[PDB]
From a paper:
Here, we show that the R-SNAREs VAMP8, VAMP3, and VAMP2, which cycle between the plasma membrane and endosomes, bind directly to the ubiquitously expressed, PtdIns4,5P2-binding, endocytic clathrin adaptor CALM/PICALM. X-ray crystallography shows that the N-terminal halves of their SNARE motifs bind the CALMANTH domain as helices in a manner that mimics SNARE complex formation. In this study, we provide structural, biochemical and in vivo data to show that the internalization of VAMP8, and consequently that of the highly related small R-SNAREs, VAMP3 and VAMP2, is mediated by specific, direct interactions between the N-terminal halves of their SNARE motifs and the ANTH (AP180 N-terminal Homology) domain of the endocytic clathrin adaptor CALM. Thus, CALM:R-SNARE interactions ensure that R-SNAREs, required for the fusion of endocytic clathrin-coated vesicles with endosomes and also for subsequent postendosomal trafficking, are sorted into endocytic vesicles.
In an attempt to obtain a structure of a complex between CALMANTH and VAMP8, a construct was designed in which residues 11–41 of VAMP8 were fused through an artificial linker of six residues to residues 1–264 of CALMANTH. The resulting chimeric protein (CALMANTH(1-264):VAMP8(11-41)) crystallized and its 2.0 Å resolution structure (final R/Rfree 0.183/0.199) showed unambiguously that residues 15–38 of VAMP8 form a single α helix with residues between Phe16 and Arg37 contacting CALMANTH, consistent with the truncation data. The VAMP8 helix fitted into the spatially complementary groove of CALMANTH, lined by residues from helix 9 and helix 10, which was blocked by helix 11 in the unliganded CALMANTH structures and by dimerization in CALMANTH(1-264). This would allow considerable flexibility in the positioning of the VAMP8 and indeed in the crystals where it bound to CALMANTH a VAMP8 SNARE motif could reach an adjacent ANTH domain to which it was not covalently linked. Key residues in the interaction, 13 on VAMP8 and 16 on CALM, are spread throughout the interface between the two proteins. The residues in the CALMANTH:VAMP8 interface are highly conserved from human to fish. The interface is mainly hydrophobic in nature, burying a total of 1500Å2 of accessible surface area, and a full list of interacting residues is given in Figure 5D.
Residue numbers in the entry: 5 to 258, 1015 to 1038
Amino acid sequence: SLTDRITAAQHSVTGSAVSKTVCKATTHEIMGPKKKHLDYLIQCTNEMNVNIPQLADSLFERTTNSSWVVVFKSLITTHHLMVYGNERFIQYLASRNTLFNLSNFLDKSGLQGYDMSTFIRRYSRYLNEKAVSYRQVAFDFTKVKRGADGVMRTMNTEKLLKTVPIIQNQMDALLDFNVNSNELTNGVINAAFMLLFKDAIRLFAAYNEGIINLLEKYFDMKKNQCKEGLDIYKKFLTRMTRISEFLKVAEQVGNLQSEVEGVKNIMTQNVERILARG
């Protein structure tokens, strides 16, 4: 039967089809991964007959390429699957103990490759942290129910104190991408930035809701919990200027206006409440 399952697998073309599509999503063409290939891979993540770790292996493999174009596109494809694919994909990445290792990545083929290597390294760290965040709390901050009956707003004190700093780590990694509007000049980096922006808006909301919950609980916590809360407030306050810059860039490059306005509004409201306590 194990022998049967193996022989069956040696006659299956599923894995090979998946790998070929990963290659098509990550060609040397300087454009975002094509929608048709991303869609096919999304459907793959819905298929129980698809080997998810093998699909992930193919994406990691493409990140060993020397070309920034191939590497960046593999990161983008991975991100796209984490966001739009079956949740078992990000769940699987969260379960791995080795993720992307692109901290030394440097393509020297020309100025474009050189400039893009910096963003590849930052983006890779963000995707690693996105997986790690899921691993640490066992859910995706950008997917959970929001509002007063939502996850972040209803979380109990002890969990809340452990959870907000994880949101803060994922946020920091996202904010470290740090691209200027005049650097968004090719389809590859633009595709990555669109996904980052989508994550960011949802992440900012989760962060704000965590802060709101803390503010509501503040007068009812133990003393050591208050200390941790204060540490959370202080870190919230110090990232405001970096968050403001992020939203500014997103607007320069063009709900967009609205979703950003609500982030500015709730964040401003939170700042005011925090400063009023101090």
